[PDB]
Amino acid sequence: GLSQGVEPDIGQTYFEESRINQD
Numbered sequence: 001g002l003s004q005g006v007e008p009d010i011g012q013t014y015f016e017e018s019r020i021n022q023d
Contacts, residue, residue, distance in 0.1 A: 001013020002014070003018070006019060008021050011023050
């Protein structure tokens with residue numbers, strides 16, 4: 001989530017940006 005670039009963030013806020021994928 002949040003905003004960072006890409007790889008995934010399925011969690012945190014979104015699906016795709018915060019490439020470490022937090023809760």
